[PDB]
Amino acid sequence: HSFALPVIIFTTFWGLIGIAGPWFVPKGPNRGVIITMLVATAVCCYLFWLIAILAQLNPLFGPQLKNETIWYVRFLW
Amino acid sequence: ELFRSEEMTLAQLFLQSEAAYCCVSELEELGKVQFRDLNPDVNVFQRK
Amino acid sequence: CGPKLAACGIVLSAWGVIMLIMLGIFFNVHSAVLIEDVPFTEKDFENGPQNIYNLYEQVSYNCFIAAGLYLLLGGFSFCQVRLN
Amino acid sequence: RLWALSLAHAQLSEVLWTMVIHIGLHVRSLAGGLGLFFIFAAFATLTVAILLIMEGLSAFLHALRLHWVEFQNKFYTGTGFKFLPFSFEHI
Amino acid sequence: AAGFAIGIVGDAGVRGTAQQPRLFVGMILILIFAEVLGLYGLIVALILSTK
Amino acid sequence: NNPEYSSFFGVMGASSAMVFSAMGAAYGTAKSGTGIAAMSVMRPELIMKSIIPVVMAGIIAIYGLVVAVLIANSLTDGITLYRSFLQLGAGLSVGLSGLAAGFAIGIVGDAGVRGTAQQPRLFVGMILILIFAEVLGLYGLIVALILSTK
Amino acid sequence: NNPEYSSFFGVMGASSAMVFSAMGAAYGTAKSGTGIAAMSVMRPELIMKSIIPVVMAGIIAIYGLVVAVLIANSLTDGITLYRSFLQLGAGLSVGLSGLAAGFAIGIVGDAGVRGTAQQPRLFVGMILILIFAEVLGLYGLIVALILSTK
Amino acid sequence: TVPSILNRMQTNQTPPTYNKTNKFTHGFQNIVDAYGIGTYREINPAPYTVITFPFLFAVMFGDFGHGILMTLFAVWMVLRESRILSQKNENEMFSMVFSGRYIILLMGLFSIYTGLIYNDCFSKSLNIFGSSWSVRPMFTIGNWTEETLLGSSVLQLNPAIPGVFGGPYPFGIDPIWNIATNKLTFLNSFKMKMSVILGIIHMLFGVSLSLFNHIYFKKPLNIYFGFIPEIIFMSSLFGYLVILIFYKWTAYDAHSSRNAPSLLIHFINMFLFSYPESGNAMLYSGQKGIQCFLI
């Protein structure tokens, strides 16, 4: 197993919203707005999550905690 | 398509003066049309 | 009163019930992100976690009781919005 | 500007928690329940006024500022006459 | 600084409101943008006094 | 190794980042609120357009907050006197640039709002002038982030 | 080897490059901005031409940022006092020449706009006057680029 | 009897500008038109704005708690629509927020999405996410093991070193970063770099929309002497900045943290043709030649 599989799943979910979503759109003047809306939703939502994951990967320092909190996590988890 | 400003054309209209009132009425009832001014002398006491 | 205050009491009722029940649940599961929020004391390290767990239970009950006060604000405000 | 507004919004929310909601928690059921009700009602009022209304309007205008300036100025020339047709639909 | 902002805005805003009662809601928004400077001063002071 | 009487400059950094930016946003808000209030008498519909200078002042205080918090988190007991001066220079460079921007927006917000009520075409001009005023807060943040992380 | 306290002047260079330039660009934008607002009422067509004074005040802030970056990217703990003085000198040279340029841009920008409102032929003269106000920022910048690389 | 004929003119002045509207798109078009009116056949910002404005707002407004509040308000205005259309209009504020109801909903919904991934409700986490962080038993391995003793008396830092740390993480922001004292350093590194990346992406979209605009006007010179050198200038700065950020997030890790290079300093050094031959190391092989070539 690798974190790449969750990334592939998430990328596929929004990739289908940005491709198959447009292919389900009806006819008439609103079509180009709805296509752009679906595509741009997938783009912006995907990019925000992707930056968050890349910043969560390989941390150069970890969390630092108060005396009471770093004690009570011994039992609460 | 709505990703760009919608397509238009300028046209020149030849109008008989008795038909003209009814012509303008039908154009304003249709409501898809904007007139281009050809009378620079237009004012409250100079307008035809 | 007026309908404005009744609508405010309806909004506060819905939000208050939702959030105080969510906190009552987070206190009931002894959530670590609430360690600063629970009113713990220097004695609540003695023998084991049972002392701090009794305080988590107290603040969990307090939140569920507080959601009940937002249900009373609800019932009152759903009268006032019709009465005004 | 994205980061800047986000930090302000987050820390405004943090202090509103830290010196309102935290005070309502108490070691007895009646005093805790009553305290929580009034403390959270004060929190909601301040949270709406400061964050939902005022920082909402700030983020609204700044999101549009970036959008109108540091996005649209690359391509939208934004110079032209509004279509204002002569119509009976204005009656 | 927030006091200066509330002072000028409260004076000019109440005077405008008495001439024109439409201003009041606008004055409340502009007053929150003054009052919040004190709250930023607090945010930084609570950090500084503890970290 | 490091002297005491030394975390002082970084603290004056965090303080001045919040103080002189709060002064900048206060002038920006006080002058813009004066212009908006006096304007609203003649043009009551205009307020939610003409509030923009007040918001362009509120951001200057937040540019102060960004640096002030960034410094106050980067303070430590026995902080190297070098880092401490970099945090002072950051704090002043946002603090007094935000003050400069606070004047620049307060002045053009009062005049721009008054002019806009006398002539509605000015609104596009005013918001364009406010970009060139508010960017002075940004240039203080840019150098302050560089000095904070160098 | 090189002293503690040696970076202080280099930091005050980075700060002064910015702060005084932002004060110059703030004056330039404030004063020309009030001019544009007052003009626009009588002459709505001139708004988008009349931004040039504001744009040139914006360039004085840029000259302050350029040097402030070139100072701040050149600080270190071990800085020989020579390099630190050069950075203070650079930061005052652009910071205060930018201030001088900005003070000129504000005054010539306002007078130039009010004159152009009444008489459109001034606009070429207003640009030529304004070039000689903005170039003082460039001369400040040249001396600051030179000093910060001695 | 005269049918009143016309002809299509050729030597034309520039025609007026228009686009269709509906309940959702109307507000998004109004906020375009208030800033400016496009030239004839110009690209319309409004279809991109339908997402882009709600997105920039929800990045600015990404609290899950406020996301719910904003959603509830906008949903109430949509559900009561047929009643509110009969009510007073003289309250211009109420009329304005009601006229925004659909755009206000979308920005509120995206503020839930950003609020969830940022893992903030009212400056608190949701406990639904797993742990990347290390439980106390993980420090017993001799490596950094003084944490297990010092934690009973003084503040202590997790180093995030391999074998101690939980490794790669698939959720949003880890819940631990709401309770930790150092949180603002880590969270600001994220929001700072994120704001740079999104801004770069939106400028790269803006120049790409410039190409479509120049193609729609069918002008070879605007593409060849405008767009081509413009995008090469931008890409030769921006591509390197993003590559460096993404490279650090892949090639470096906790054990590499000591003497790890600064991204902003490599970007300024590149722009200045001025790597200092000393101090912070180069990030990759041949990088000095690459910096020089790009600038």
Q: What is the DSSP string of H175-233?
A: THHHH-TTHHHHHHHHHHHHHHHHHHHHHHHHHHHHHHHHHHTT-HHIIIIIIHHHHHH
Q: Using CA atoms in the order F84, F88, F90, F91, what is the torsion angle rounded to 10 degrees?
A: 130
Measure the CA–CA gap between D31 and H51, rounded to whole angstroms. Answer: 47
Q: What is the 3-state secondary structure (H, E, C) of chain A?
A: CCCHHHHHHHHHHHHHHCCHHHHCCCCCCCHHHHHHHHHHHHHHHHHHHHHHHHHHCCCCCCCEECHHHHHHHHHHC
Q: Determine which helix (DSSP H) or strand (DSSP E) holds H156, and give its type and residue range.
A: strand H156-157
Structure tokens at C72: 């009373």
Measure the CA–CA gap between D4 and H147, rounded to whole angstroms. Answer: 35
F72: which DSSP letter? H
Structure tokens at B42: 């237009």
Cα-flanking dihedrals φ and ψ of residue H182, to 5°?
Answer: -75, 0
Measure the CA–CA gap between B39 and G5, rounded to whole angstroms. Answer: 78
Q: Which amino acid is at H41?
A: R
Measure the CA–CA gap between H254 and H175, rounded to whole angstroms. Answer: 19
Q: Count Cβ–Cβ pairs < 8 Å, chain A vs chain B.
A: 9
Residue E6 three-state SS = helix
Verify whether the Cβ–Cβ distance F62 to D57 is below 8 Å: no
Longest Cα pair distance anywhere in chain F, in angstroms?
A: 66
Structure tokens at H46: 């409004």
Best CA proximity match to F104, nearest among F21, F24, F17, F18: F24
From chain B, which residues contact D within 8 Å (Cβ)? 27-35
Resolution in A: 3.7
Best CA proximity match to G26, nearest among F93, F94, F135, E2: F135
Structure tokens at E8: 């000028």
Q: Which amino acid is at H195?
A: S
Measure the CA–CA gap between F9 and G5, rounded to whole angstroms. Answer: 11
User: Per this entry, what is the length of chain H?
Assistant: 295
Q: Which amino acid is at H117?
A: I
Q: Determine which helix (DSSP H) or strand (DSSP E) holds F56, and give its type and residue range.
A: helix F52-74
All residues of chain H having their beta carbon less than 8 Å from the beta carbon of residue D64 are 31, 35, 53, 56
Measure the CA–CA gap between H63 and H70, rounded to whole angstroms. Answer: 10
Verify whether the Cβ–Cβ distance D52 to H63 is below 8 Å: no
- Residue H278 burial (CB < 10 Å; 0-12/13-18/19+)? exposed
All residues of chain H having their beta carbon less than 8 Å from the beta carbon of residue A2 are 168
Contact predicate G85/G9, CB 8 Å: yes
Across the strands, what pairs with H6? B13
Domain count, chain F: 1
CA distances from H207 to A36, D72, H203, H230, H233 (A): 17, 10, 6, 8, 11
Count other C-beta atoms under 10 Å from residue A10's C-beta. Answer: 16
Contact predicate H222/H234, CB 8 Å: no
Verify whether the Cβ–Cβ distance F73 to H262 is below 8 Å: no
Measure the CA–CA gap between F29 and F38, rounded to whole angstroms. Answer: 14
Contact predicate G27/G64, CB 8 Å: no
Neighbour-count burial for F120-142, b at 16+ CB within 10 Å, e otherwise: eebbbbbbbbbbbbbbbbbbbbb
Structure tokens at E16: 């405008």
Count other C-beta atoms under 10 Å from residue H30's C-beta. Answer: 14
All residues of chain G having their beta carbon less than 8 Å from the beta carbon of residue H272 are 70, 73
End-to-end CA distance of chain H: 73
- Residue D72 burial (CB < 10 Å; 0-12/13-18/19+)? buried
Contact predicate H166/H151, CB 8 Å: no
Q: Determine which helix (DSSP H) or strand (DSSP E) holds E47, and give its type and residue range.
A: helix E23-48
Across the strands, what pairs with H7? B12
Place of tokens 């652009």: G94
Measure the CA–CA gap between H291 and H62, rounded to whole angstroms. Answer: 36
Structure tokens at G77: 């703990």
**Alpha helices, DSSP H only, in C1-84?**
2-28, 50-83
Measure the CA–CA gap between G42 and E32, rounded to whole angstroms. Answer: 35
All residues of chain D having their beta carbon less than 8 Å from the beta carbon of residue C36 are 22
Measure the CA–CA gap between G148 and H7, rounded to whole angstroms. Answer: 69
Q: Count Cβ–Cβ pairs < 8 Å, chain B vs chain H.
A: 63
Residue F148 three-state SS = helix
Domain count, chain C: 1
Measure the CA–CA gap between E45 and E47, rounded to whole angstroms. Answer: 5
Contact predicate G30/F104, CB 8 Å: yes
Measure the CA–CA gap between D8 and E42, rounded to whole angstroms. Answer: 12
Best CA proximity match to F92, nearest among G63, G79, G18: G18
D36 close to C (CB below 8 A): yes
Contact predicate G125/G49, CB 8 Å: no
Residues whose CB falls within 8 Å of the CB of residue H177, separated by 6 or more in sequence, listed in order: A63, H119, H125, H183, H186, H187
Residue F54 three-state SS = helix
- Residue G130 burial (CB < 10 Å; 0-12/13-18/19+)? buried
- For residue B12, the distance in angstroms to the closest alpha carbon of chain H comes to 5
Structure tokens at H69: 């509040």
Verify whether the Cβ–Cβ distance H46 to B2 is below 8 Å: yes
CA atoms within 13 A on the CB side of E33: 34
Distance of CA A36 to the CA centre of its chain: 20
Contact predicate H160/H133, CB 8 Å: no
Q: Using CA atoms in the order D29, D31, D37, D43, what is the torsion angle rounded to 10 degrees?
A: -120
All residues of chain H having their beta carbon less than 8 Å from the beta carbon of residue A57 are 168-169, 249-250
Q: What is the 3-state secondary structure (H, E, C) of chain G?
A: CCCCCHHHHHHHHHHHHHHHHHHHHHHHHHHHHHHHHHHHHHCHHHCCCCCHHHHHHHHHHHHHHHHHHHHHCCCCCCCCHHHHHHHHHHHHHHHHHHHHHHHHHHHHHHHHHHHHHHCCCHHHHHHHHHHHHHHHHHHHHHHHHHHCCC
Measure the CA–CA gap between A15 and A8, rounded to whole angstroms. Answer: 10
Structure tokens at C57: 């239970």
Structural domain for C68, as ranges: 1-84
Count other C-beta atoms under 10 Å from residue G132's C-beta. Answer: 11
Rg (CA), chain H: 27
- For residue H136, the distance in angstroms to the closest alpha carbon of chain F comes to 25
Contact predicate A25/A38, CB 8 Å: yes
**Alpha helices, DSSP H only, in chain H?**
25-33, 46-60, 64-79, 81-84, 92-99, 101-117, 147-150, 176-179, 183-216, 220-221, 228-251, 263-271, 287-294
Neighbours of chain D (3+ CB pairs under 8 A): B, C, E, F, H
Beta strands in F16-141 (DSSP E): none
Place of tokens 């006229």: H99
E24 close to F (CB below 8 A): no
Measure the CA–CA gap between A7 and A14, rounded to whole angstroms. Answer: 11
Structure tokens at H88: 């007073």
Scanning every residue of chain H, which has its alpha carbon at the shortest distance from the alpha carbon of D70? H203
Scanning every residue of chain B, which has its alpha carbon at the shortest distance from the alpha carbon of H11? B10
Verify whether the Cβ–Cβ distance H254 to A65 is below 8 Å: no
Structure tokens at C43: 């004695």
Structure tokens at A17: 């919203």
Give just the sign of the alpha carbon dihedral H164, H166, H167, H171: negative
Beta strands in chain B (DSSP E): 11-13
Structure tokens at G68: 């402030």
Best CA proximity match to F10, nearest among F61, F97, F60, F78: F78
Measure the CA–CA gap between B23 and H282, rounded to whole angstroms. Answer: 77
All residues of chain H having their beta carbon less than 8 Å from the beta carbon of residue B5 are 17-19, 38-44
All residues of chain F having their beta carbon less than 8 Å from the beta carbon of residue E22 are 40, 44, 47
Residue H170 three-state SS = coil
Contact predicate C53/A75, CB 8 Å: no
Best CA proximity match to H139, nearest among H160, H167, H169: H160
C54: which DSSP letter? H
Measure the CA–CA gap between E14 and G91, rounded to whole angstroms. Answer: 45
Structure tokens at B1: 């398509």
CA distances from F70 to A49, F26, F147, H114, H186 (A): 24, 22, 11, 23, 11
- Residue H279 burial (CB < 10 Å; 0-12/13-18/19+)? exposed
Q: Would residue H277 be called left, alpha or beta, if left means φ above 0 and alpha means ψ between -120 and 50 degrees?
A: left
Verify whether the Cβ–Cβ distance E34 to F32 is below 8 Å: no
Verify whether the Cβ–Cβ distance D86 to B32 is below 8 Å: no
Longest Cα pair distance anywhere in chain C, in angstroms?
A: 58
Residue H7 three-state SS = strand
F55 close to D (CB below 8 A): yes
Verify whether the Cβ–Cβ distance D12 to E29 is below 8 Å: no
Structural domain for G136, as ranges: 1-150
B12: which DSSP letter? E
Verify whether the Cβ–Cβ distance H183 to A61 is below 8 Å: no
Residues whose CB falls within 8 Å of the CB of residue H10, separated by 6 or more in sequence, listed in order: none
Contact predicate F60/F101, CB 8 Å: yes
Cα-flanking dihedrals φ and ψ of residue H96, to 5°?
Answer: -65, -50
Count other C-beta atoms under 10 Å from residue H96's C-beta. Answer: 10
Verify whether the Cβ–Cβ distance H127 to C33 is below 8 Å: yes
C78 close to A (CB below 8 A): no
